[PDB]
Design a protein around this ligand. Structure first.
Ligand SMILES: C[C@@H]1O[C@@H](O)[C@@H](O)[C@H](O)[C@@H]1O
Ligand SMILES: C[C@@H]1O[C@@H](O)[C@@H](O)[C@H](O)[C@@H]1O
Lengths: 108, 108
């Protein structure tokens, strides 16, 4: 199961966001691996100031594993650093931070 | 070597683009596999009307393998169908159709 997601970034915080992601906290990464998230990349587009996340989810209840992460206190502290850098899409659903995208094509 | 890329889509052509990609021409996929492109997905975001492509490139000279594809006669015919659906970013470099993104994070 593949997922693509999208969020805005504030241009004045792009360097800070890159610095943070050069050394993502081990507790954050372990909590992501425990929720069955693998092969996870984030891409940046300037000048449109968009972040594209891609990951492969090997779990069996996505909505639960995501709420697991959402309450990990170390991940919530990490989000106090990343969040201010980001600009959630005005068009997202209630409850979304990153906005989900629809897969329209895959080839192995 | 992971790569992320982005292009616009015209909302009036979204259904046609999805239909085309439900059965991508076998010659197009063969030329992509022979250029060492693997694990290739395309995601769509409405309402921002953005397409996000992700692939993993196991080749040795990216700029050459991309040029090989760009001259394949069957791929150029295929692009006469996809292209009219797309809206290349006004901000892209000369020579780009899809605009490349910068990887800022990966975890396995
Ligand atoms: C490791 C990643 O770091 C930031 O980019 C967050 O927005 C993501 O939710 C994730 O925690
Ligand atoms: C298979 C893919 O199909 C369309 O989306 C094109 O824009 C891509 O370049 C690629 O050929």
């Amino acid at each position: 199961q593949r997922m693509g997601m999208v969020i805005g970034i504030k241009p004045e915080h792009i360097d800070e966001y890159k610095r943070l992601h050069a050394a993502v906290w081990p507790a954050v990464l372990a909590r992501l691996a425990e929720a069955h998230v693998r092969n996870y990349s984030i891409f940046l587009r300037e000048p449109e100031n968009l972040l594209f996340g891609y990951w492969e989810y090997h779990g069996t209840d996505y909505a639960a594993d995501m709420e697991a992460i959402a309450q990990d206190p170390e991940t919530r502290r990490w989000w106090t650093f990343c969040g201010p850098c980001q600009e959630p899409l005005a068009s997202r659903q209630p409850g979304e931070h990153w906005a989900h995208m629809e897969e329209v094509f895959h080839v192995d």
